């Protein structure tokens with residue numbers, strides 16, 4: 001009767017229900033469920049070519065150009081029509097290629113199919129089906145190096161998986177068996193028992209089970225790998241798109257088009273040409289005003305910039321966003337693996353005798369056998385790859401520091417058995433009973449471990465110092481824990497605390513392993529603090545100094561302790577030594593206490609604010625009025641959960657800041673997607689994780705993403721402004737002829753539009769970006785006073801030389817006056833056509849050189865090379881032709897002029913116009929300040945960040 005959403009069909013499923021779904025029906029249920037859900041295939045439509053063309057041809061411009069071709073054919077200017085078709089043909093081919101390439105990349109990612117082993121309710125079939133996989137299907141996963149087709153909760157056993165594409169996470173991720181329960185929660189809601197579509201399985205092992213077996217949850221390409229590709233198809237728009245502002249500027253040109261049309265009507269009525277004939281002249285005037293090569297030129301800008309970035313390694317999707325890069329005002333960054341260096345030496349461990357802390361051991365090897373050694377060795381979730389161990393750089397560096405070595409493939413639920421170094425001045429090899437994974441939001445990991453001693457099993461928890469110390473029973477927790485940790489965090493050593501609890505369970509029993517994560521991480525005794533050292537990436541310190549110099553503010557968003565983030569921030573130059581840092585702190589509103597905000601300064605040898613994640617939680621919920629003041633003044637957001645990083649992005653955006661994210665981790669995945677410009681620095685090739693994936697492991701990417709964006713925004717504005725200048729230069733030329741004896745050209749018009757303008761337009765879009773990022777932001781409105789001024793003033797100079805030419809031509813003593821008794825197509829030679837075309841041809845080229853204006857955002861014009869050769873070549877051909885048309889006289893329909901003097905006068909006028917155009921654009925750059933000061937002495941931006949800044953300047957936060 002009424003359709004129900006697949007999510008709505010499977011939203012309320014129990015923990016038990018996922019196990020109920022396991023060993024699902026072989027065929028009848030499969031077929032009906034598969035029919036209801038639809039086939040498990042990516043929904044990218046496949047088009048041979050002509051299938052695309054019909055859809056592609058529906059664009060409104062294409063219709064107008066088709067009408068224009070017919071109109072020009074009716075006028076019998078075949079040659080101009082021959083060009084007008086050909087330029088549209090180039091436009092459609094390039095648009096087709098652009099569209100085809102954009103789909104092809106995405107389609108190539110999702111073009112994967114492989115034979116799958118599927119479990120029957122009383123069966124275990126092998127390689128039976130893949131694309132037809134049942135929505136609730138249970139399957140046995142491959143042993144090693146196996147891509148996972150569907151998002152499936154793991155019912156039994158443990159899996160090691162590479163999720164690098166899905167989460168931006170190169171490091172191997174542990175997967176564990178789901179626990180059946182009366183409560184219903186989604187596998188995604190667990191966010192760990194689920195195995196995600198298109199993720200490689202490094203290894204798969206069942207300690208107790210015969211093999212690892214998983215039950216499919218959300219599937220059919222509409223979740224995970226496809227859910228993101230599906231996002232890339234029909235993508236999210238940008239608000240207040242600059243094309244609207246350009247569309248307003250087209251309306252200013254539309255007034256000029258109407259004014260021209262009425263001028264023509266008066267001239268034609270005065271001329272007394274047939275009314276039927278006058279309509280064709282009016283129609284030609286309107287069609288001429290439309291530029292044929294603009295639609296192609298706009299594509300070629302983007303395609304050249306994608307080409308420029310692909311070579312730099314910054315692999316891009318949604319190429320429209322490269323301009324958005326140009327406008328970004330703040331760039332958010334992550335601490336570890338981006339601002340700092342991935343991989344960290346363990347700078348020893350600190351042990352505690354009783355309540356008191358003992359002095360730090362430089363090398364973890366020289367310590368007594370007991371809890372801390374075992375915890376240091378066993379806490380990690382490292383697995384053994386071919387002749388090697390694979391894990392998180394922190395956990396890997398810790399175990400190598402202990403000197404204990406992981407046992408290989410060769411009880412029941414016994415895994416990752418830890419072999420001792422076997423050097424003595426007890427070896428007691430130890431085996432893990434239960435593994436708990438580390439979640440960035442959760443901020444800790446835990447293990448249950450047993451030994452041949454066969455005592456009560458001991459649970460070891462390694463996690464964030466504050467949460468672990470808080471979780472520990474306050475018996476062992478030292479009085480000065482906070483102050484002692486403050487030494488290590490202030491130094492800049494990433495610190496993780498280890499807590500041990502003896503657990504009263506039956507040792508080496510599978511059943512005994514089953515336990516509540518909270519119950520294992522409940523009552524705890526603080527054991528020691530690890531002192532991991534992460535060092536700043538060499539290039540980070542430079543890029544941040546430039547981004548601060550441009551006045552694009554750099555905000556740091558991190559899950560690590562506030563003092564470490566303050567040390568990294570003070571190091572990079574987020575906060576310079578001259579600058580002052582305030583630590584906003586908040587007390588929870590609860591019992592008899594209301595919410596309190598306390599601001600405490602920090603002093604070290606622009607009023608920068610550093611906020612812990614929890615303080616920001618209270619500020620957003622219980623101080624909404626203050627949030628604008630902190631988020632416009634906050635530089636070092638720290639101890640932030642993965643969800644909190646998205647909130648900073650969203651609140652900074654609602655304050656009208658253009659955010660950017662250069663994170664390299666699963667924690668940032670949310671923030672990267674939400675942010676305007678998102679860059680994932682550790683990914684290989686194009687990926688769905690971020691809009692602008694990089695393959696260089698540095699912040700050196702981010703300046704390049706801004707620098708190219710500003711170039712693409714200036715190229716888009718230059719190509720638009722040159723296309724307007726050409727059309728009005730054509731309008732003036734065609735009109736000067738329309739008044740004067742009702743004449744035009746055919747082959748001449750093909751030559752101008754096809755060779756002079758289309759070649760220059762495509763070639764002017766490949767200049768490339770400026771060397772150094774600049775203080776001045778690229779101008780963002782096409783309908784600006786400078787742009788409008790520049791175009792209008794230049795067109796006056798165009799007309800001046802053009803009219804001057806005609807006056808000089810008529811004034812020439814040898815000049816023979818033209819017949820002016822016969823139709824424009826019939827009068828193949830006209831003495832005026834020769835002069836007007838010959839003067840106008842060169843000026844069409846000159847406009848591009850003046851328009852280029854290559855300095856703040858683009859490199860000097862000469863550096864282009866293919867443009868510069870073409871400009872000179874076409875100029876040389878035109879110089880050659882104007883002096884001596886020879887053979888080309890006949891095709892050009894040129895009236896041969898023997899007199900050298902008038903040709904030199906004509907060359908002089910073009911040179912004068914050229915000098916004029918260059919002088920006008922240089923004058924325009926110099927004149928802007930005087931104009932701006934007089935037009936507006938002072939103004940206030942509607943955007944909230946610029947006002948809140950100005951308010952804070954007038955009255956600061958309480959000092």
Ligand SMILES: Nc1ncnc2c1ncn2[C@@H]1O[C@H](COP(=O)(O)OP(=O)(O)CP(=O)(O)O)[C@@H](O)[C@H]1O
Nearest residue numbers: 334335336438440443444445462463464558559560
């Ligand atoms: N394997 C592990 N087991 C337990 N805790 C870990 C851990 N690896 C990191 N931690 C700690 O867990 C907390 C949360 O880490 P999270 O992934 O959110 O950020 P992070 O410390 O990697 C800094 P960044 O945000 O720059 O990536 C931190 O205090 C971190 O030091």
Ligand SMILES: [Mg+2]
Nearest residue numbers: 336337664665
């Ligand atoms: Mg990271």
